[PDB]
A paper describes a structure:
The main protease (Mpro) of the betacoronavirus SARS-CoV-2 is an attractive target for the development of treatments for COVID-19. Starting from crystal structures of the Mpro in complexes with the Hepatitis C virus NS3/4A protease inhibitors boceprevir and telaprevir, we optimized the potency of the alpha-ketoamide boceprevir against the Mpro by replacing its P1 cyclobutyl moiety by a γ-lactam as a glutamine surrogate. In line with our original goal of identifying broad-spectrum inhibitors that target the main protease of coronaviruses and the 3C protease of enteroviruses, we also assessed the inhibitory potency of MG-78 against the Mpro of the alphacoronavirus HCoV NL63 and the 3Cpros of enterovirus A71 (EV-A71) and Coxsackievirus B3 (CVB3). Finally, coronavirus Mpros feature a catalytic dyad comprising a Cys…His pair, whereas enterovirus 3Cpros have a catalytic triad consisting of Cys…His…Glu(Asp).
In addition, we prepared MG-131, the P1′-N-methyl derivative of MG-78. The inhibitory activity of MG-131 against the SARS-CoV-2 Mpro was found to be equal to that of MG-78, with IC50 = 14 ± 3 nM. The complex between the Mpro and MG-78 crystallized in space group P21212, whereas the complex with MG-131 featured space group C2. The resolution of the structures is 1.8 and 2.5 Å, respectively, for the MG-78 and the MG-131 complex. As in the boceprevir and telaprevir complexes, the α-carbon of the ketoamide warhead is covalently bound to the Cys145 Sγ of the protease. The oxygen of the thiohemiketal, which is probably anionic at the pH of crystallization of 9.0, accepts a strong hydrogen bond from His41 Nε2 of the catalytic dyad of the protease. The P1′ amide oxygen is fixed in the oxyanion hole by hydrogen bonds from the main-chain amides of Gly143 and Cys145. The extra methyl group of MG-131 makes a weak (3.3 Å) contact with Nδ2 of Asn142. MG-78 and MG-131 make ideal hydrogen bonds to the anchoring points in the S1 pocket, His163, Glu166, and Phe140. In more detail, there is a strong hydrogen bond between the lactam oxygen and His163 Nε2, and a three-center (bifurcated) H-bond between the lactam nitrogen and the Glu166 side-chain carboxylate on the one hand and the main-chain oxygen of Phe140 on the other.
Author numbering:
A (entry chain AAA), B (entry chain AAA): 1 to 304
Amino acid sequence: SGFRKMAFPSGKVEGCMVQVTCGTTTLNGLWLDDVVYCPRHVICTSEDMLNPNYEDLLIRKSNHNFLVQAGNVQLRVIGHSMQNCVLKLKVDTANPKTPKYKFVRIQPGQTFSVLACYNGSPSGVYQCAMRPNFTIKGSFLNGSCGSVGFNIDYDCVSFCYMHHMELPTGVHAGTDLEGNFYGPFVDRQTAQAAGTDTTITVNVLAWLYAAVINGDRWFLNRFTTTLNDFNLVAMKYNYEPLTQDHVDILGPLSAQTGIAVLDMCASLKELLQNGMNGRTILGSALLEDEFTPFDVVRQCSGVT
Amino acid sequence: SGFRKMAFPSGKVEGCMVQVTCGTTTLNGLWLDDVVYCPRHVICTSEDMLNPNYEDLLIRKSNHNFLVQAGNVQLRVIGHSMQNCVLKLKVDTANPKTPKYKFVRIQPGQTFSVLACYNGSPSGVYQCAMRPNFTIKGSFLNGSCGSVGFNIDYDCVSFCYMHHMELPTGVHAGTDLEGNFYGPFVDRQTAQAAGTDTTITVNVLAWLYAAVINGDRWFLNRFTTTLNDFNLVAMKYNYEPLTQDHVDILGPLSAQTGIAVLDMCASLKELLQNGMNGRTILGSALLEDEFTPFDVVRQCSGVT
Ligand SMILES: *[C@](O)(C(=O)NC)[C@H](C[C@@H]1CCNC1=O)NC(=O)[C@@H]1[C@@H]2[C@H](CN1C(=O)[C@@H](NC(=O)NC(C)(C)C)C(C)(C)C)C2(C)C
Ligand SMILES: *[C@](O)(C(=O)NC)[C@H](C[C@@H]1CCNC1=O)NC(=O)[C@@H]1[C@@H]2[C@H](CN1C(=O)[C@@H](NC(=O)NC(C)(C)C)C(C)(C)C)C2(C)C
Ligand code: NA
Ligand code: NA
């Protein structure tokens, strides 16, 4: 028993992290096969950042402008390309440590693990979720750009995030590895705001299943509810709506604990209106919405 | 900006994790050089656990009783030894992936990263601290035994914890890699209780420095305090006492933010007496004591 914010092992992704320098601007790229993926604003200067025309900045750039450093080796760049907001530096040499990998664009609510890098070197690993506003609450300093979010399906590293931007609040924005931004954000240093940040209800419900399973049970209560009437209440507290899919998803946990989702909804409903009255659940004083139904199943069945 | 519970990269330690089976009982061992370290209760059956005489259980055991499995290889065991509560299986082959390593016994308050394993396979990584009662609040299921806690000093993996036991509460106990238990715990399934779990004050003070640095500043206040008078108050809320060493330790953060420790103590003092009044600090509704002064410096300077 016990329940933690737990990242996948970083080891397989560690092998893929390289430094990418362009003039002054230096940051992290991801090396899979004979291609290094990095944010395209590696090309920009501090001033260029204010309003870049990348197309235009790319004209005065050749393969040899791009310093791909793998720890203390230099990969030869034999091609560069722009795919939405990432550069794809074709290098002579395939990453020998390339894992089985996919690029997936996550939906909001899905969680993934961040391997935070500086100078193309892992500093730390942590979990987080794609909020519904399409930000994440990372920890990221200058030089973190091109650090990646991943999940692992046993053998296979699924890459979902490349880190580009911080927004006032210390929330973060970035791209899939196809370089399409999550949410309405652009790689410019112009005004642009996150929308309302909603709570991921299905994730909060899974957390409570995770709570129950560990023997924190007190929030449980006599009442049941309907999807519709729980939403009437949720909406107000800025919770993502719940759906039959969310319910089907939670089934495993429902089956594990013998507590129908709709019962757990009633339990969660009261906590929304009455708060936690000083108590914790799994040593959290607030309702934790950064666990997928899978995160709990993973951690409470203990899959590897 | 942004601040997370962030584990070191697991990759270097991943290489060291092997399955160890003895009859029925199967769990994780750590493979460095020609030695595999595991909990000694690999030898016990379910019944033996109730009150084992290891010395005595070790008599009816030979090298060949111990199945050291490295993914899908079998390491030959050419020697076994008992060091307090760990076995040391001498094998023919040195782990080629052995990192630069040390074994350190941490003091309580120090944090380290857990790489949670089943069948000698990394399932997940998370940070935690050695509470002052000498428990940790892991997440650990049956098969997790012999999973290790580590820190990294740039090149060098420092191993501080091997996981043995869960206690009612879902708190956990275990050993240094010399197999001496942290705290008064024994590898028997007998009654034995954790002491009072105290809050790690120096760690809470660092968290607030971490808060300040990210622009959560509101808890800051007009008052200063003395070490003595803050303790008079702390004691009551079950906070670890503060010392001149704790103050010298926090200096870097004090210097970073221009806020004397004793000021931060006054700020923390009021929050102890008045609570947080619904507000969060770094999106935590309670005072987080699972960050070393180094954890913040690491994450907020961004060392690798
Ligand atoms: C990134 O380039 C890097 O790590 N290498 C230098 C960097 C990461 C960033 C630094 C602080 N925290 C982080 O996550 N990202 C940037 O420098 C991006 C680049 C240039 C500015 N910028 C920002 O993130 C800026 N944010 C905003 O401009 N904010 C709004 C869009 C809401 C205004 C700063 C102010 C520097 C954080 C672009 C976005 C291409
Ligand atoms: C470990 O052996 C393993 O993972 N491989 C089988 C296992 C880890 C444990 C299972 C549930 N959560 C965990 O962290 N540890 C044990 O089985 C240890 C072994 C045998 C019993 N035991 C316990 O942890 C038991 N706890 C207690 O006995 N509790 C007190 C000492 C306070 C009574 C259980 C009840 C099984 C959790 C010894 C301690 C050698
Ligand atoms: Na970009
Ligand atoms: Na033991």
